[PDB]
Amino acid sequence: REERKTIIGKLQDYKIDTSLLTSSKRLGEGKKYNWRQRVEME
Amino acid sequence: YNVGKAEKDGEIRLKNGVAMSKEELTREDKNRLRRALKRKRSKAKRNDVVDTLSKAKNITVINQKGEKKDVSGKTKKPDSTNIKL
Amino acid sequence: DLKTSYKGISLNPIYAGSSAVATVSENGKILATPVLDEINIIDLTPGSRKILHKISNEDEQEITALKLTPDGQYLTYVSQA
Amino acid sequence: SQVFGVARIYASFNDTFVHVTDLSGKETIARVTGGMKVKADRDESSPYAAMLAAQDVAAKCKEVGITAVHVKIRATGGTRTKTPGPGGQAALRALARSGLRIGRIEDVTPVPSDSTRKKGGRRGRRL
Amino acid sequence: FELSDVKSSKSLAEIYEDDYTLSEELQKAHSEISELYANLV
Amino acid sequence: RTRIVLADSKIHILGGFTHIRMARESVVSLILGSPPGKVYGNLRTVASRLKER
Amino acid sequence: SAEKHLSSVFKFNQHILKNPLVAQGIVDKAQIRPSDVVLEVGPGTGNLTVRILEQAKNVVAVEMDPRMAAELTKRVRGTPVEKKLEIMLGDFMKTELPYFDICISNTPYQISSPLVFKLINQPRPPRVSILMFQREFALRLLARPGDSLYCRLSANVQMWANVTHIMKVGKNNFRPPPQVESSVVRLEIKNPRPQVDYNEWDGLLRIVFVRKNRTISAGFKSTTVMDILEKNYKTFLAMMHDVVKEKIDTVLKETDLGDKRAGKCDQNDFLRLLYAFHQVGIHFS
Amino acid sequence: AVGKNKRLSKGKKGQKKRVVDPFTRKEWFDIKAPSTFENRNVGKTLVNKSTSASDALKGRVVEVCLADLQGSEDHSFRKIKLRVDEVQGKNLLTNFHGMDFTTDKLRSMVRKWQTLIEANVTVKTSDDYVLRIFAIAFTRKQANQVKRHSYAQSSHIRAIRKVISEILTKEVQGSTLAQLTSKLIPEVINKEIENATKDIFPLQNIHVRKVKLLKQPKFDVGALMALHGEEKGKKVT
Amino acid sequence: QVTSSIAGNHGIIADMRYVGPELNKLALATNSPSLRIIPVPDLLPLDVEIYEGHEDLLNSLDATEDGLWIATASKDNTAIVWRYNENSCKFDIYAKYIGHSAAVTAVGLPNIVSKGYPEFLLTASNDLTIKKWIIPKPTASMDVQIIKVSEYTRHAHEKDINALSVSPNDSIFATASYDKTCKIWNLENGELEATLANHKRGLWDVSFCQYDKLLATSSGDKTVKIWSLDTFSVMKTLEGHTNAVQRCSFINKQKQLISCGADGLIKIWDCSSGECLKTLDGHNNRLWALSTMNDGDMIVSADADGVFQFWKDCTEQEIEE
RNA sequence: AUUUGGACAAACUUGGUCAUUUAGAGGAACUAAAAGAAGGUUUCCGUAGGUGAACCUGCGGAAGGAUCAUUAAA
Numbered sequence A: 001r002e003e004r005k006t007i008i009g010k011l012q013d014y015k016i017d018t019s020l021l022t023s024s025k026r027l028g029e030g031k032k033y034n035w036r037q038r039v040e041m042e
Numbered sequence B: 001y002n003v004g005k006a007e008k009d010g011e012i013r014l015k016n017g018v019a020m021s022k023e024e025l026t027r028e029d030k031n032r033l034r035r036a037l038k039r040k041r042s043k044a045k046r047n048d049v050v051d052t053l054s055k056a057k058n059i060t061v062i063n064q065k066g067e068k069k070d071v072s073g074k075t076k077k078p079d080s081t082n083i084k085l
Numbered sequence C: 001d002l003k004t005s006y007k008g009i010s011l012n013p014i015y016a017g018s019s020a021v022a023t024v025s026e027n028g029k030i031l032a033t034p035v036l037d038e039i040n041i042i043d044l045t046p047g048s049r050k051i052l053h054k055i056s057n058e059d060e061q062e063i064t065a066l067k068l069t070p071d072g073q074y075l076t077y078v079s080q081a
Numbered sequence D: 001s002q003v004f005g006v007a008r009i010y011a012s013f014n015d016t017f018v019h020v021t022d023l024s025g026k027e028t029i030a031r032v033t034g035g036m037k038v039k040a041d042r043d044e045s046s047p048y049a050a051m052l053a054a055q056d057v058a059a060k061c062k063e064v065g066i067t068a069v070h071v072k073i074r075a076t077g078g079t080r081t082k083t084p085g086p087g088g089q090a091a092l093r094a095l096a097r098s099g100l101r102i103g104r105i106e107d108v109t110p111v112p113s114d115s116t117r118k119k120g121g122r123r124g125r126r127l
Numbered sequence E: 001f002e003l004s005d006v007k008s009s010k011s012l013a014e015i016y017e018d019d020y021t022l023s024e025e026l027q028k029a030h031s032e033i034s035e036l037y038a039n040l041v
Numbered sequence F: 001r002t003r004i005v006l007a008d009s010k011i012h013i014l015g016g017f018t019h020i021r022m023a024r025e026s027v028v029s030l031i032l033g034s035p036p037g038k039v040y041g042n043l044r045t046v047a048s049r050l051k052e053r
Numbered sequence G: 001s002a003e004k005h006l007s008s009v010f011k012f013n014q015h016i017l018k019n020p021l022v023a024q025g026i027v028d029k030a031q032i033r034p035s036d037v038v039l040e041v042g043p044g045t046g047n048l049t050v051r052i053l054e055q056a057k058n059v060v061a062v063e064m065d066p067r068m069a070a071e072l073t074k075r076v077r078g079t080p081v082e083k084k085l086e087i088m089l090g091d092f093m094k095t096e097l098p099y100f101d102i103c104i105s106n107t108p109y110q111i112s113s114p115l116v117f118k119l120i121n122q123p124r125p126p127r128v129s130i131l132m133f134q135r136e137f138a139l140r141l142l143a144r145p146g147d148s149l150y151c152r153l154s155a156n157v158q159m160w161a162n163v164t165h166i167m168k169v170g171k172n173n174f175r176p177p178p179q180v181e182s183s184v185v186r187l188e189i190k191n192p193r194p195q196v197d198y199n200e201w202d203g204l205l206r207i208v209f210v211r212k213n214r215t216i217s218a219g220f221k222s223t224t225v226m227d228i229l230e231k232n233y234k235t236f237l238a239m240m241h242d243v244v245k246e247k248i249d250t251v252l253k254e255t256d257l258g259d260k261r262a263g264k265c266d267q268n269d270f271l272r273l274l275y276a277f278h279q280v281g282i283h284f285s
Numbered sequence H: 001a002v003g004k005n006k007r008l009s010k011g012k013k014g015q016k017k018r019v020v021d022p023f024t025r026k027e028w029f030d031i032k033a034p035s036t037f038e039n040r041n042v043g044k045t046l047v048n049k050s051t052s053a054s055d056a057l058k059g060r061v062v063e064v065c066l067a068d069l070q071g072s073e074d075h076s077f078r079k080i081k082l083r084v085d086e087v088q089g090k091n092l093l094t095n096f097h098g099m100d101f102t103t104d105k106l107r108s109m110v111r112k113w114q115t116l117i118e119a120n121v122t123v124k125t126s127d128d129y130v131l132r133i134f135a136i137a138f139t140r141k142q143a144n145q146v147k148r149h150s151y152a153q154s155s156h157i158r159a160i161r162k163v164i165s166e167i168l169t170k171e172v173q174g175s176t177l178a179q180l181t182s183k184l185i186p187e188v189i190n191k192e193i194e195n196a197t198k199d200i201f202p203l204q205n206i207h208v209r210k211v212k213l214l215k216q217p218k219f220d221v222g223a224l225m226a227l228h229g230e231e232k233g234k235k236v237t
Numbered sequence I: 001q002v003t004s005s006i007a008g009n010h011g012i013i014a015d016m017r018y019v020g021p022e023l024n025k026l027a028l029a030t031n032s033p034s035l036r037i038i039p040v041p042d043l044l045p046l047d048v049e050i051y052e053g054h055e056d057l058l059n060s061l062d063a064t065e066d067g068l069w070i071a072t073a074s075k076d077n078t079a080i081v082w083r084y085n086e087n088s089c090k091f092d093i094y095a096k097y098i099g100h101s102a103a104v105t106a107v108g109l110p111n112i113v114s115k116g117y118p119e120f121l122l123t124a125s126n127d128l129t130i131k132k133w134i135i136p137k138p139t140a141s142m143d144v145q146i147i148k149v150s151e152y153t154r155h156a157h158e159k160d161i162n163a164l165s166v167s168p169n170d171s172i173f174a175t176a177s178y179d180k181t182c183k184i185w186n187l188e189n190g191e192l193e194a195t196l197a198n199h200k201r202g203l204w205d206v207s208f209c210q211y212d213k214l215l216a217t218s219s220g221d222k223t224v225k226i227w228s229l230d231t232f233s234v235m236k237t238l239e240g241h242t243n244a245v246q247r248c249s250f251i252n253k254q255k256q257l258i259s260c261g262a263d264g265l266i267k268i269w270d271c272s273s274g275e276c277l278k279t280l281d282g283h284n285n286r287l288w289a290l291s292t293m294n295d296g297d298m299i300v301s302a303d304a305d306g307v308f309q310f311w312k313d314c315t316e317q318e319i320e321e
Numbered sequence J: 001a002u003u004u005g006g007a008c009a010a011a012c013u014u015g016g017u018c019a020u021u022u023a024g025a026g027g028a029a030c031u032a033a034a035a036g037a038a039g040g041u042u043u044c045c046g047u048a049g050g051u052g053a054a055c056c057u058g059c060g061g062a063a064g065g066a067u068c069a070u071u072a073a074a
């Protein structure tokens, strides 16, 4: 268990987002905006 | 031939042979006719599942989209200012 | 307010869906054009263009050849039948 | 006074092709399928859809100049069934009614001397 | 419903032929029952 | 409402288009190994429908 | 006239348990505190749900069959516990479930795997869950490293929870009897959740459990895996196929796991493999 | 499926308009068979008019029944491929390209309780046409035979195959392509095989099943003209 | 020279715009290289004006609100700008834009024209890029100006770009692609403002609400979604189409939306509540084109068979009766 | 390029002031409310797998699994 805690602690130094990473699931496949109102109103 | 129910939806036809349009009736006459029908009706399985669901209040329906709605079909929905004021 | 009720006017094609050549009368006033299994006899008088007649065989057989007499009194056509 | 084409009928389980060409086969005159003649996918292989396709093809043949055709009907063949189905029989009857001379009828299904594995698996297919 | 597992004496044209053109056998027994009941009575 | 010729491993089915497709599924079930008793039961369900329509 | 809406979500088209000891044993093992709100999956007629209603603060029942919901409703009308029950009708996997401390489920086995991960990913997840699965699927949750049934599910589920066998339920205990054996198991989601990205953990496991009884080195030999990892390395640099080959070789050699089998590896071996890959810049997912 | 209910596809968006009938620009061409065949007219084919027409016509292969070419139904089950080589004034001059049987005839011949013997040889004519011949034969039972079957021992089959290959090689080598064709029509090769194999084992349905043309020499217009048995124009005014 | 031409049919119509100084003319982008312009019928119009400047069929079309400018996107990888010549009362080729690798599928013109001429041109192509082209100031030479340099070029989508829409103030524009997403770009820089990815099938159309900050998108999943440009999130989802929705437009300012489907039906929705008020059935084929005039008082829809329907608002007439 | 001053002036933040829709909870009015059945599934062996598993799948094998009709020829 104490080894688990040390390894998990060291991971956060190397942590990133995963949105752009390809999933391993792929291995198988191989004026103002509303000026128009303004003219009509006046 | 025997006199039956009114063919039009806006009229009352009795077995007496007398027809009555809802437009020509006065308000007092519409009330007694409503109560007269009530007396007549009083003495006179999936659907059984549906009404039981509607009768109970602690029922929430989840549609295909996952959104939460009541048995009736309308979306099921304290603040200090609201309660104090 | 809300814009719900709408009234539509249709503009169908007069000449389409066939290999037959359109024909016109000698004076150039009457034009007969095949549209699939139907024929549109059209008046070309300027200011008053209209569909004089609509001929629909209903047999579903298209028009192969279509001819309007030079005088414009008769229309002769042949179908795939 | 008798110009011959070749009416190549391909009757699959899910469709029927009626394809008329010249004697060489390099030159297409009219290709119509049963799926061009029906509103539902389920009916593309029907004998009804094959009859509409063949009548549609026969009319185009008479216009171009073809007055007779040889018939080369086929099934999918290969690892699948070797006999043309009811859709193909329907087209052949429709061509005969059409008024074109029918020259010679042959079955040209692709029959393997040997095959690769069929798609079903060890337990079979076509429930 | 009972499904016949024996060869049909009617040819495939005949099964279509008769389609072109509550039960008589059921009513046939009914006449027989009335005959038997009438005689016994 | 069809007729079937079982010539060794070669099956020919004669009938109307919708009918011969009904006959083909039953034959294919038997080939795939479904016992005849279970097949005979399904035939009764479809046979009942055929008379209704 | 509710037929309009309920017919648009249900068509109005099961194996019922018949041993009271199984039903009783489940609720006692839950150890429901008097201040616990309980999510109950698969109320059935209501044999169990009444027992949970007696000892729980509030009970939220999720059902899929409108008939079975009505049967639940009838069994609690005009009762002291009517005010503690909330029935959610319809597919409950798409909906966002409320907060709950305990989950007691007579799961439809079709949704066993999705459910086990729905609870684990639930924000502020439950502390204990008594779930009933089939023997084959249940034994894979309970499988230990080096067992024959050790798989991706065993490794993934054991990183976020601890699964313990409670009892076995035979096919005879249901009517009509199913063709497969059943089993009741306890799942305890870990609090705090371990600080390992789910996508990274699952991403590594998928590549190496394609052939669990094959060496880890062979798992990284597939061209498609190389293509996936090569793109991911490019993404890392953005914020070289030959290079990735050398990077994978060093990690597998240094960790001394390249000649090991995933079926005979534990959490630490995968964690060491995961960490070593991060050092060389290879992020799986 | 052309119904409205059919879901819209991506490919329907922009489609070319049909504004030209292709058959307006097509030109018809007459196909003529070599002189070895009795009926030289073998129909007609069409091609786009020259903008050239000759290029698309050359190399074009047409297969026809021998019964049409000879006007006798004895050849109903045999087909001849003809390849266009020269075009002269709307006449496409063709040469022998291959021969094959109908599928129905082959299935008709293959029967149970007998031995199927097939031989093939790759051999070249004197004109340097490399071709592959396929011969098929079947064992038969004698007039007084009482056994149900007529199987041959594998020693007989190898002996028969050796004899057939020897005959096929001899006939092709000592002959030109045009002369080889003249042998195929009267089925004289098959009678030669029957006589040679008579003392080994009785046989039936001896046929030259197929002929493939693998390689061809340099095309020679003069030889083609002779095989078919120049024309000044007419002044345009 | 030809005195006059009669149109037997107009083929398959991809897009339409109201054009001309009185907006009585209707420009068509058919499956033909020629730009057809027909007069709006009095409510048989055989006559047609055929302008030939392109080499292949026209994918899309846009015009300015005054009607004196037209932009045509063609399958020959080029875009032309046409200007109305009051002297001849006919449109003339003003400029050509040649730098695309594949077919130009969508084109866009400014909604504000202050100098008397439009100043930019947005184009999208099957090479999956969007380019901003500047339009030259008018020159007396009256010779076609050929432009081969674009203000910017941005890679936009992974699948063919189907529609392009410009906001009222010319500050942003949106592209709809069959890769199931709609992207909003800053018109001045081309910077990606947002990505609207909620549909399950590829998008066929995208339409800015000309009055309020709203965007409507139509997809092959048979639904239309309304997006808030402030939050860039789906406000409503409109269901009811049996087949894919190919066109969507706002009418009656923010109040209502009109959509066309491959089933051939035109539906009018209520944006606030998202329920179909009315269904117009006059077509027997898919509808690739839908143009409105005077904020939906007049609506024109074109069938794939070549049938036009001219819908005229008549609510107040009905209410009076 | 860049600087001073003078008007035009988009766009932003703010407290107001006008007009329009609009959410829950109350209070209190008016009107309407003429109906009346049953129904998918051969049994296994060896081996290898499984995350919408009340069971699925790949490979080779077994019957310990219900044979009708035509058929020598001429």
Ligand SMILES: [Mg+2]
Pocket (backbone or CB within 6 Å): D126
């Ligand atoms: Mg099938």
Ligand SMILES: [Mg+2]
Pocket (backbone or CB within 6 Å): none
């Ligand atoms: Mg096994």
Ligand SMILES: [Mg+2]
Pocket (backbone or CB within 6 Å): none
């Ligand atoms: Mg053995």
